[PDB]
Symmetry: T
Subunit: 165 residues, 12 copies
């Protein structure tokens, strides 16, 4: 059946994306610098925990429908399909920019996956909607730092050495 | 007796002000944007919980001296007597400005109320002093973002698109 | 897109209804009287906490799909579209009657909203199903006080001064 | 030895009675209606937890003296030897009446069992005294709703549509 | 000094009243019967804990200003100056009636005591205001069972065998 | 309406299956023997708690859409429609075999039920997807003991006296 | 039956003794002075909590076998039958002496009561054995301060102004 | 009196046996090896905690009836009267065999002791029944690994290098 | 205004005294010796925590009325105005003597301060009454070690090498 | 300085090894199969948490001595220098074999690193000793499954389809 | 011996530095102002707790090797040997600058002390390495606000009124 | 290798000493008498828990470097090499004297062991430094009861029947 194939594909692809996000949030947690370093250090820890919890649920849902889960380092690298986080000290505006985009792209892809599996496997779809919920919430939490308002454009000039982000 | 009338007036007026503050802190919690969005999101959650706890105490003190408590939406609107929080995305400096002022005006009014009821109802006065304590603490916590220091005026230029707040 | 418009409408309308319910449950929590006053005081506190939690989730889901959330007192009043709770001391049977109806009407409307947004935004639909779940559970918990049984009609005569409710 | 037979009989018969009580308390927890529905819903949850804990202790005491424990649905039905709880919506006075009687009859039987095994197996007797303690406490908690006092017969007329229970 | 005498008198008299209330709430906790027996059993436990906590604070405030505290059974009996709770099974309406009155009279007396010691010993006055706060809250919680409303007089006929309380 | 009939049928049938599973997991918890007795004793306790929690949710969802819930022993026996667990001491491989199958069949049936009620009652469907999620997870947890791998068939010979399971 | 009379007598007499002990331990908790004041203040708090817990169990066991419980102040005074604790500041050696004796006499009496009711009411006997257990443990904890050892008589001279206790 | 002698003997002999068991369970906790090493490591930790708790209760019951408790290493060695646990790495089947026997022999002896002291000291008998309860439960938990079933003899061949245990 | 000056003076002077007390209680916590060393080590830890909590409240009340708080080491030294605690190993009687006096003098001064600010700033007065409450409680807890009783002068001879304190 | 270079090298190399171990333990947690699947699932979760905690400490120690931390997926792959865990369903004996070896090799390398940095950076050495402690403990916990004993070689034949591991 | 002298010197000097840091972190906690006031208020509270915990460990290690600990205010002032924190309102950039430097200098000195005592007193050295660990971590946490990155120098211009820090 | 021999010797010898201390602290916990009996009862419980925790760590470190741990009663007796605690009732001064000495001698020996294994096994050395830390802290806590001060020799005359200890 390509109803098991559909399920596996959607779960496995989401798992890898969450694992990529685990590694990038931690990396940023450690290396972020600037005015918002501590704020972001704390926020990224919370995201990491939420992402880790859903990575474990997604992997065990995969096992639950009868397939092994591939969480290997090689598999994470092989699925790049997503900008990589710079090494070294990272700037607060750079971290914000980076996750605004990553969470948005990951959320979009999960959104597609929910549609794909919804009538063959509504239980897997339900799980993926929960993952999408958290990813899009995290997206807002990064986006909110640069959100345009009636009194202030929020260009990020102050967290970016005078320059818009 | 206008010793029950005094007590009711002081308690009821404080209740409505706290309920107005519940709604405005939550609104700001959701909609705040900019460099300090997350910081303020967390701080406003703490204030909301403190305000909610005292709203419940004030309402039940009113019941305790023998009068019903009016916590209706219509009553909150009817007591405006206090600037309203803008809708839409709100800027961090705008939120700070707004609560610096609201908490100050609410604290002042409670201060007056403590004097009013102190010898007819010292138990109600004691409660209102506790409310004033928390409101003025919250006032300092908003004020501290723009507090002038020997090395830095803290105009809020960085959180306000180059302009003093 | 009127897929963002659909989502915003469903989320915003639900938020206001939950906020209306926050205010009415608390009001009843304070002012309820009679044989079941304490029972209802405790039950209404539990409902208030459940409703408050989902109000926060609904507002932040709205932010998560890119729109501000309107939780203002004026907006609650403006959306009346729902009977208002009496002021003053409220009778236990009156509170029961009132929420049986409110929860039922709010649950119905959320039910409609779930259908409306389900294929444009299954993640928002999932959240609203969770809200509907709790609202309808609360509906049963109010309804159960007057539920007709094989041995007893449960007219509420005992909690209503000899008269059916 | 009919000292193991004695022990097994007393433990097994008590286990089945507790399991019958697990099912009836939950059933009543869900279906109770009327003025005391919520009160009883909460009280029956507490009883269910206490009963469940002792069912587990009784079953594992049976294993501890070297015999398997029969907790099957068929065995519960086979040991009826005890009125069955009506299906459908149940009235508060009906639930109270029902458990007043069930707890009393179960407590009596355990009381007999304590005497039976006390000198062959004082450790099993000790456990059964603890079960009897809780069952008789629960009996008082149901009985107390209809307990005659110097100022009021407590006929249950108010929770029974004008009629004594 | 009769500023220590004033303080001692106010503290000691309050201690005895709280201890009288400890004994009466527990007695009622055990012996209450009728429709509201369990409700009142739980409510009276909460009051007992609040009263016990303040009895300990009042006694240790007495020690703190340099005097021993008399918490003896003989002293409780000697200070009757307050209706005694009936023995035997007590009816729910009887318990409600009884504490409505006791809490009211105790609250009144503490209120007087606050005035008496307020300028010689504002710290003792502060403590007594906290005791008055809780006692009057408990008074409302008993009073609320019989509170007259626009739709229902709440005579207590249902919890009193057809007769107003 | 046969939209309430649909909902009731799906909820009621699931409730009975969960209650059957409550009884069988506990039975196995007590009576399991062999190399994996303690492992399974602990695992079956965890399943029992998860199953019990969802049984309570399913029963109260049934009440929430306006129908009583039938959790009686007779009803559990009447719905057999599912192999019964042996009495006496049960072998670890026998327990594993038994639940691998039970959880699989129960999960399948819930899966069908989700489809059945999904557009008349998406809130009930959502609940049943959560039940299916847990049941299928539990299925994997039993299946994993005998799961074929590249280095070892996992026949269960070691937990079955030399014989494949 | 004088098997209910036996049970009531044993339970009621124990309740009063525990309540007497509640009042005396608290009194000593507040008023104790000297080298061991703080030690004893803490120890007496622990005893008070243990005694309070068993007073509640004894009273509710009395209700459980169908009789009201008399916890009134007048009843405590009426059952003196036991030395009274001095008022005023109490010396550490005096407190130790006093409870060594009280706990011993109360433990003895409960011991007799266990024999009295053991075959009419083994469940009540079991409870009273638990009370005796704690009372005799508390007796050792007071006795241990003056316990004669091979290297030191422990006369209490140091806690008694040079004089043996 | 040889009623104190009886009590002391029963308590002291049980204490030493529990202390012997403390040392053997820990030893096995550390040194166990094989397929069931981790399972047994965890199970033996739980037993150790239960045994330690009762050792403390038994020793303090001894003090409570007026005698010192001998918990010395020399006394443990002197009371051997019980097979000693091998040193070095211990096999899972060896640990299981060993405690099946130890717990059984210790439980038997405590059982005798309960009879011995039951009418001179029912409070000490009650404590020893609680110790026997736990010891026999632990006995079942070890025995269950090798328990014969209708589908599998459970010889332990798999945990014993092909050989029955 | 010298109503802000009054408030600042009272708050600042209390802060410094509490900080002096933080340092002295810890110093004594570490260095106390003798019969009551451990008792006092524990008691002084509790006082330190209570004092630290109020130091933080006093400092933040100062900020709340618009002034900075001076908690510097130099400021603590500059406000000596209070005996200094000896260095080196400190004797139990010396610690008791020392805090009996310190707490008394600090409590007195706070008492004066409460009067000073009570009508310009009742909220600050309320806070200072809470500080006075704890300081005077701590005073009793030190005083109680040497408190004269009808049976024993409590000279402290035993904790002072034969000599009255 | 090549004292910062030394520190960075030792910390960075350890971080990557811990991150490799995070991924492999989770992978095994999900995919392990066979008799010991659940046991190992639980054990590997505990190891994962311990490893994750030290990965965070090692990365933040690196930041603490002034260097960024590289936790990227590419860096984990680039440092292979260590056998990779198979994908697909993994057998219990295979998991045990695999971590016995991995933990041993990682522990050895950390051991070397402790020597390397010990006198330039004893604080980093201290941290690495703590990491080595946990890694070697985990090594024993895997090794213990196959540990040779006087009564049983523990070849793993039972967990490996008749064949030694 | 000047091995006790060495130990005392290293411990005592570290204690004073930690106590200086306790006072400065709290001072900054209260008085910090500007964009990062709340962030720093929270961060400085965490540091204060970590510093307080190690101050207590260092003082009690000093006692453990047989010397008293000097924690007096005079001793803190006497050891200045370290810039003092300004009084009045302090700017966020000023606080960051100040602790970046203080933590660095304190960490350096502890580092030296670890070398000094390492072979006379490795247990004291171990403790001091733990103190150094936390101090240097806190140093990074302050330093990270101004850490230069590839996209942004992080001069602190935004938190310093346009000027580099 | 005699680097494993060194490690084993140091770990095994420490384990036995900690186990000896477990037994002696408990023995003293039970049997201590006199003025400081309760104080010491509590203090010795805390030491016992700290000692037990490190005994478990030391034994599992031994396993971690590849050797079994000998925790047998016979081995404890065989390693006497340390005064034995008297049986019977023990005097407070005797307990203090005894542990002052035991902890000192055990701490000394561990100190030697740290030197012995430090460069072959720094991870084992680190663990032993932690054990030494706690043992020497416990030594101070016993020593502090008799510590000579400028105002009082602390001979223990008061806790020793007039005689210096
Ligand atoms: Cl899980
Ligand atoms: Cl409340
Ligand atoms: Cl949240
Ligand atoms: Cl259990
Ligand atoms: Cl307290
Ligand atoms: Cl619930
Ligand atoms: Cl209870
Ligand atoms: Cl205890
Ligand atoms: Cl705070
Ligand atoms: Cl952290
Ligand atoms: Cl500590
Ligand atoms: Cl562990
Ligand atoms: Fe967090
Ligand atoms: Fe998992
Ligand atoms: Fe999960
Ligand atoms: Fe930046
Ligand atoms: Fe918060
Ligand atoms: Fe409330
Ligand atoms: Fe409250
Ligand atoms: Fe802004
Ligand atoms: Fe609640
Ligand atoms: Fe929120
Ligand atoms: Fe939420
Ligand atoms: Fe959901
Ligand atoms: Fe009514
Ligand atoms: Fe409950
Ligand atoms: Fe169980
Ligand atoms: Fe249990
Ligand atoms: Fe009814
Ligand atoms: Fe309660
Ligand atoms: Fe107290
Ligand atoms: Fe208190
Ligand atoms: Fe009634
Ligand atoms: Fe569990
Ligand atoms: Fe439920
Ligand atoms: Fe639930
Ligand atoms: Fe088997
Ligand atoms: Fe306590
Ligand atoms: Fe109770
Ligand atoms: Fe109880
Ligand atoms: Fe018991
Ligand atoms: Fe004395
Ligand atoms: Fe455990
Ligand atoms: Fe103990
Ligand atoms: Fe215990
Ligand atoms: Fe084996
Ligand atoms: Fe404490
Ligand atoms: Fe603070
Ligand atoms: Fe505070
Ligand atoms: Fe207050
Ligand atoms: Fe002294
Ligand atoms: Fe775990
Ligand atoms: Fe971190
Ligand atoms: Fe950490
Ligand atoms: Fe295998
Ligand atoms: Fe914190
Ligand atoms: Fe300390
Ligand atoms: Fe510490
Ligand atoms: Fe360490
Ligand atoms: Fe600034
Ligand atoms: Fe403790
Ligand atoms: Fe262990
Ligand atoms: Fe440990
Ligand atoms: Fe002595």
């Amino acid at each position: 059946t390509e109803d098991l194939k559909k399920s596996v594909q959607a779960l496995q692809n989401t798992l890898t994306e969450l694992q990529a996000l685990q590694l990038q949030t931690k990396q940023a947690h450690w290396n972020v610098s600037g005015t918002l370093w501590y704020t972001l250090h704390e926020l990224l820890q919370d995201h990491y925990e939420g992402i880790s919890k859903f990575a474990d649920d997604v992997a065990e849902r995969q096992l639950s429908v009868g397939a092994s889960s591939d969480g290997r380092a090689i598999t994470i690298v092989a699925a790049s399909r997503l900008p990589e986080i710079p090494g070294g000290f990272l700037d607060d505006a750079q971290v914000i920019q980076f996750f605004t985009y990553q969470y948005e792209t990951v959320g979009q892809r999960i959104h597609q996956r929910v549609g794909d599996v919804e009538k063959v496997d509504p239980t897997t779809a339900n799980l993926l909607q929960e993952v999408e919920h958290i990813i899009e919430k995290y997206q807002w939490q990064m986006r909110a730092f640069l959100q345009n308002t009636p009194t202030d454009p929020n260009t990020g000039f102050d967290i970016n050495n005078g320059k818009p982000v």
